[model samples]
Target: TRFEKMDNLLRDPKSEVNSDCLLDGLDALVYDLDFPALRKNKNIDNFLSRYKDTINKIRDLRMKAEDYEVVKVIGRGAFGEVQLVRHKSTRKVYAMKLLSKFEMIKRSDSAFFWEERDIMAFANSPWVVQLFYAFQDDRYLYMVMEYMPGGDLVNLMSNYDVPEKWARFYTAEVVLALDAIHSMGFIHRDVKPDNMLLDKSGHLKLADFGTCMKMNKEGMVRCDTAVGTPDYISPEVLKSQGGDGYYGRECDWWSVGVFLYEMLVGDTPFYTYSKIMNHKNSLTFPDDNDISKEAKNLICAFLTDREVRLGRNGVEEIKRHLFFKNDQWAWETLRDTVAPVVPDLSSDIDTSNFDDLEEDKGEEETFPIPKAFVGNQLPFVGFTYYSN
Candidate 1:
């Protein structure tokens, strides 16, 4: 009877359902997220507990077949907007997204309905915005996901400058998410800052599955037409290269590296001007501002060829890098998220042991300032270079 009552309530816009009661037993539910061995890392669990309530609401609403009250508007998207709601009995607030199926179908983007569901079906890592519950009405589908009260990462970055070390730490968390998605044969085609949300405790969550795809054997997926926020797209996406596409998981890594740079420097590398002027292969650094050589090297690695691009499994590379270990601090346990009591900074970070895949063979004089940016006045940059 409760199941039927719950289903009816979800379908009935006029119905009022208690919000927080939907997650009554959520705390007991263990997250079976498909992260590598690393998911079990203590730090990850410590981070996830902060959202126990939010995730529990999602789990109970969908898995337990509970009803929730629709609250005020919180966020907006292509299909519709999300609202801050609570269950009538529980009196707890939740961020609920309202999507109209008819409008999604009309826009030729109904596939996302399934993609969103599929993504939420599993245990999401820190990099992913966890799903609580999703229910559909005759006209709309309600997706109850975690609300990053801090809003999105871009909003935070706009007001305050991000530290380089913290950026690397955040990137480490994301690599787990990307690796898990790839392991499950999915591609998060849209990897941008707007999609990266923050929770109540200021942790990151990869949200928005609008352009996700499941790859077939030989582990390849196909998605025609341009997707992802344009600013973070890879060269292959720009070139529209399909069938053995140059982008995909590898492309996501490039975007991650770019994101780290943006966090550290507060602006993207290779910017022709203020906006994201992604000139292909443009590695010029500006004179007025400067990023350390190590940071520049890391960005250059991601921007370089796929084979040399940070190698596969960004996590392994990070663990071994002096950048992380360089600080005199010794790891109490890799599982711990916080860096151990830091040792002297002067000798702490030494990246010399790591090999730079894109290391220029010839010793070119290092330019203190960002290299002179030569922007090709056109819609695309590599069109002329690649064609010839």
Candidate 2:
């Protein structure tokens, strides 16, 4: 029995499992991640297929970081580092994140990273960051994503408090991004300023999806996982911290409220841990400037009861909000229109807009293939593989 043989092989660490067999097994799987009515748009489908071909090529070949020139470090965290890499032959730049698969296995966090890949592949919005390729080697898993040179909203906010008009523009783009995700029966459980990026054109491009949740197609939607920043944590998600509680689609909107609040004000409304945890406490609005009545109304609507939340009914409720009702503000106009703020770029490869953070110069470490990963076709199947 091959199943028995496979089972025995897994039990024995001494057994040798062909590395490329895992890649072939991936080719046998399906990753049907269709967005809501996205394929109907021929222009969009044509663009997506371009990268899908590139991704499919990787599945057919043994790809490695050697194919790309590791230009410079972009960002770094505990488990991994992101580098601004350029394909040696194509000379096309991309942000490649090299994640330590050993660390992922140790922390038992495979699902989160897998989900991030799953969600990114489904993306078809200009407002959402795009994933070109995702492939894994013995030591690390690599994700090649679009490089945005304008830095994140956090950096922009640090330089100045975003005025109401600019805040309205940026937040509106995020709403569209969230709308696209939600329409496809997914929720971006994490929504914060840092996760929201800007392209060289300074257009809002929402990134990061380790916490995204795909709801049931049959309208069965609920999430028990308590994940998100302390400040942007939704009420229902906050309540779910207690034993025997569940949350649903409405949770993401609350985070939007917190995000909007931070954009309008310099800081988050519920700053402290205690205040964030306590839903009974009321949110305070600034009384200083002549902030428009419609803008104030929009904020109040979002921070209020989930049942009456501005976008609780649907994304239409948000689009129809008085704050975004101005004649010049159409969603279509935003893509080409001059953004409120654009990063000063020396060239396409500029990293000046990003912080001067560096990865720790650690001792040379070798990443060896673990026995458990050998012939482990289960994790690299279904939602994990994307087709051309």
* Top candidate, metric TM-score: 2
How many pairs of residues in model 1 come into backbone collision? 19
Q: List the residue pairs that clash in candidate 2.
A: none
Model 2, runs deviating above 4 Å: 1-61, 218-220, 277-280, 364-388
Least accurate stretch of 10 residues (summed lDDT) in model 2? 27-36
Q: Against the correct fold, how does model 2 do in TM-score?
A: 0.79
Q: Which candidate comes out best when scored by lDDT?
A: 2
lDDT of 1 by residue, 150-194 (tens): 566665567556666666656655666566677667888767777
State the lDDT of candidate 2 residue by residue for 1-388, as single tens digits: 6897687654442222433434434343212212334445666466556656655786456556688988778788857878888988889998988887667666765677755775566667787788887766545678888998988888888887678888788878888877777776777777888788889888988777777777776543465556777777777667666566556677787777777777777777787465755544667777785667777677777776555666656678788787887555697776777888888788667898788766446763553433222333345432223223
Q: Give Cα-based local distance difference scores for all models.
A: 0.54, 0.70
Clashes of each: 19, 0
Give the CA lDDT, 0 to 100, for residue 333 in model 1.
32
Question: What's model 1's overall lDDT?
Answer: 0.54
